[PDB]
Amino acid sequence: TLRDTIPDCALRSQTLESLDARYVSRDGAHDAAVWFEDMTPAELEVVFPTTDAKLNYLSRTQRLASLLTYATPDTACVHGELLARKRERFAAVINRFLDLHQILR
């Protein structure tokens, strides 16, 4: 009793809105289940087999994407300037963090 949506649909040649109107938006829809399918692909678990490893990659690619979009002619975005300032300050901070410990010796 109280079946899920995956035993309900059984057909996947359609658009999302049709299925919405046919299974979840009908007045007679019993809607008596909540079960989120596992969407991670095995072709990705076999290489990143750890939530920490799946999060480090998910953050590295996020940083890459945020670098690529900010690097017709508007160019007047505060986020590009913020990323530039952050990169410059990070470079200048690591600069005075290796030399400072070179001096202390």
């Binding site: 899920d4 079960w35 989120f36 200048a92 001096i103």
Partner: protein, 646 residues
């Protein structure tokens, strides 16, 4: 007695599609994916709604909802009736067998903290403190403003005491107790660093005249004794004529809202509270300063009352207590602004961190007293009880006439005036310290330098005056920052016949040294001689610099076409560009973008003081300035403007 309803919930075995290799168990909820632990937006909501059950009802607040902490756990009736008809899946049998075990076992370590008397001691201490301060500290029985208020330091002291006593009496629960004391002090969202700060020992307090200094420590002790079991709070003081009042005010309430049978009292010495099962905790008074306090067993507090003028020959027992392994010498004090600097303790701020805290109402600069104005208590605001006899004056002129150190006191006259006049510092102390300490070695990182030197000379053409110094700076670009290669603060010999050449010889000597230290680095040196003082004298300096340098890098001068003239003179006129130059400098300096060369050159500032240290003393006057002006302007020139030439 059983607490709230958040630690008794049933299983709610919804479902999971994640492999057991990933799933984690959050207490109070089922078993969810591992990604729900690196997301604080969930692991900070699912954990706060748990400890919001251990918190008693006398600690939620004063208007928090009748039955629950509405600000954390409240669902509208419509939403409750809507999520009621929401039904998850049902866990598979082979998966529900271990899931229920994991769930009911990860929750047992909470229904086990709610029972241990070691934690019940802390809960009782905090709840009694709250319920007994509700009506301000008085002779109540413990059975329009009507609720008492702890000022800021009266709360910092309570936190310093409670967090340490919890970390000491509860070591096996150093995680379930931090995130409970957070909820009990209404201090969540607080990183573990700024809470572990309260775990440290020997945190000195400097308090103004009265501020309920003594009125607060006696209830603190009375509740920290009759709640915990196995601590001996040492309470030293000044001359022991002041400690007997503490005796009486502790034992009056300690016997007032409790039974006298458990109140053990000997005159002039220790006081002891006994518990109905062979337990006793005392407040043994180290005020004798002779014996009975050298051997330490469970002191852990050492409530030193007044460390302003330390008691004679009583520092030996204190320093011996500092050797005890679990002692947190609270070190209360009272600088009543009658001296404003208990330099016996105030010198601690020199080399230390997170040690002492001052409850001050006037800053270092006595002009921005309005910084801490809305914080000064309203009870201590009494005046002559008459604004004016007959006068119509605004609050500004009134407070000017009625200044009296802004607190009816007789604070130090001089220095920072009474009318603030929008006076503030400009360069942060932190950037200043880094300017002093981190100095790139330019002679060995020459590849990082731009091939142009910029020099500014800000001349003074008098002698035998303190403002008669000539400032010289030679700077350049280092990466995208600015670095100082040389500094001079030069003082004319009196009645020389050649002041411009003396100044020129000074700057040429500086340049030469900079050039020799970095051979082949520079293609150009650009020189600006400020001409505000004397155009002719500035021109003469440029001419001598020009000639002397003629004995490679090309030498250029900034030129100026004075108003109404077609002539280009080799001087610089400082006017409209001052404000932009200063503004840019301040921003660059504060962000770490201006520095001094490790091998910075100075002939004139070498024997008495470090040149960078000397420059920084001038710079800290931003709100004799020849050096500061030369440095700021040399940098502005290295920055961007109109072209200077040959």
């Amino acid at each position: 007695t059983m607490g709230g309803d958040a630690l008794r919930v049933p299983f709610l075995d919804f479902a999971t599609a994640t492999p057991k290799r990933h799933q984690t168990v959050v207490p109070g909820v089922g078993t969810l994916h591992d990604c729900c632990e690196h997301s604080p937006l969930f692991s900070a909501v699912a954990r706060r709604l748990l400890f919001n059950s251990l918190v008693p009802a006398q600690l939620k607040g004063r208007d928090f909802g009748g039955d629950h902490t509405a600000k954390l756990e409240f669902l509208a009736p419509e939403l409750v009736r809507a999520v009621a008809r929401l039904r998850f899946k049902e866990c598979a049998p082979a998966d529900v067998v271990p899931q229920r075990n994991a769930y009911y076992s990860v929750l047992n370590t909470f229904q086990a903290l709610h029972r241990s008397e070691a934690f019940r001691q802390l809960v009782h201490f905090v709840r009694d403190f709250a319920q007994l301060l509700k009506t301000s500290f008085r002779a109540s029985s413990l059975t329009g403003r009507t609720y008492g208020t702890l000022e800021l330091f009266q709360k910092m002291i309570l936190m310093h005491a409670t967090y340490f006593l919890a970390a000491v009496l509860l070591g096996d629960h150093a995680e379930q107790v931090n995130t409970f004391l957070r909820l009990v002090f209404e201090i969540p969202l607080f990183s573990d660093a700024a809470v572990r700060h309260f775990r440290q020992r020997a945190t000195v307090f400097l308090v103004p005249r009265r501020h309920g200094k003594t009125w607060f420590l006696v209830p603190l002790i009375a509740l920290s004794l009759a709640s915990f079991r196995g601590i001996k709070i040492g309470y030293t003081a000044h001359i022991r004529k002041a400690t007997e009042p503490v005796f009486e005010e502790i034992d009056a309430c300690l016997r007032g809202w409790f039974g006298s049978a458990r109140v053990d009292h000997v005159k002039g010495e220790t006081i002891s509270f006994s518990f109905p099962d062979g337990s006793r905790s005392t407040i043994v008074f180290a005020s004798s300063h002779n014996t009975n306090g050298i051997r330490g067993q469970d002191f852990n507090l050492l409530f030193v009352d007044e460390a302003n003028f330390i008691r004679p020959d009583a520092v030996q027992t204190i320093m011996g207590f500092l050797n005890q392994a679990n002692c947190k010498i609270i070190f209360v004090s009272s600088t009543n602004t009658g001296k404003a600097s208990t330099s016996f303790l105030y010198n601690l701020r020199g080399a230390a961190d997170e040690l002492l805290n001052v409850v001050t109402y006037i800053c270092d600069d006595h002009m921005p007293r309005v910084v801490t104005h809305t914080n000064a208590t309203a009870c201590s605001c009494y005046i002559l009880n008459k604004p004016v006899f007959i006068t119509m004056d605004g609050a500004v002129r009134r407070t000017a006439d009625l200044f009296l150190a802004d607190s009816f006191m007789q604070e130090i006259i001089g220095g920072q005036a009474r009318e603030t006049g929008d006076d503030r510092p400009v360069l942060t102390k932190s950037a200043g310290e880094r300017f002093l300490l981190y100095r790139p070695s330019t002679t060995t990182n020459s590849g990082l330098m731009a091939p142009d030197l910029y020099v500014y000379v800000d001349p003074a053409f008098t002698a035998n005056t303190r403002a008669s110094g000539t400032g010289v700076a030679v700077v350049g670009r280092y990466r995208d920052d600015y670095i100082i290669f040389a500094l001079e603060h030069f003082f004319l010999r009196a009645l020389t016949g050649s002041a411009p050449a003396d100044i020129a010889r000074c700057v040429v000597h500086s340049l030469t040294q900079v050039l020799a230290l970095h051979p082949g680095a520079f293609r150009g040196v650009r020189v600006a001689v400020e001409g505000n003082s004397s155009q002719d004298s500035a021109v003469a300096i440029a001419t001598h610099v020009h000639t002397e340098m003629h004995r490679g890098p090309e030498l250029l001068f900034y030129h100026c076409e004075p108003p109404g003239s077609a002539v280009l003179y080799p001087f610089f006129l400082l006017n409209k560009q001052k404000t932009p130059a200063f503004e840019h400098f301040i921003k660059k300096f504060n962000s770490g973008g201006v520095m001094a060369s490790q091998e910075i050159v100075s002939a004139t500032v070498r024997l008495q003081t470090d040149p960078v240290e000397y420059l920084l003393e001038q710079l800290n006057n931003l709100t004799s300035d020849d050096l500061m002006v030369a440095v700021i302007m040399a940098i502005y020139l290295a920055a961007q403007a109109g072209p200077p030439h040959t």
